[PDB]
Design a protein around this ligand. Sequence first.
Ligand SMILES: CC(=O)NCCCC[C@H](N)C(=O)O
Length: 140
Amino acid sequence: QCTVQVRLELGHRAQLRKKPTTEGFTHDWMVFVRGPEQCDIQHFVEKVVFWLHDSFPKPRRVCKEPPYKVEESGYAGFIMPIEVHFKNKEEPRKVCFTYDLFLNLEGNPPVNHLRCEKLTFNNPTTEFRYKLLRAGGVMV
Ligand SMILES: CC(=O)NCCCC[C@H](N)C(=O)O
């Protein structure tokens, strides 16, 4: 018996483009998944999948190594499914978040937002428990 907690940070940045794109997109934005300072989530994250709006081509964006991030231009915010796939052999294999990707509108300063997620793994296998603790996971 034991439980291991690890921390994830999902976030995004958005600002007006000085010059809109050829499509006339108003904003540059960037969405990421990272660990807190001095934590290496690569130890237990196999890959992160960023499910972009259907407008963007190849909207399935995969980061298999850090940095787990996507940079694009846009005209409006949307709901971005983000899938964090674990280096786990048993369940759960992944965790899904629906990320609120919103833009700074009507001359508000740039957007720079962070969403902190705590994952609780009950009775992980030996192999996966090492990866969690190597990433800076803590037993409770
Ligand atoms: C590039 C860009 O801005 N794409 C559109 C994103 C918003 C789509 C719409 N508001 C929706 O939520 O489906």
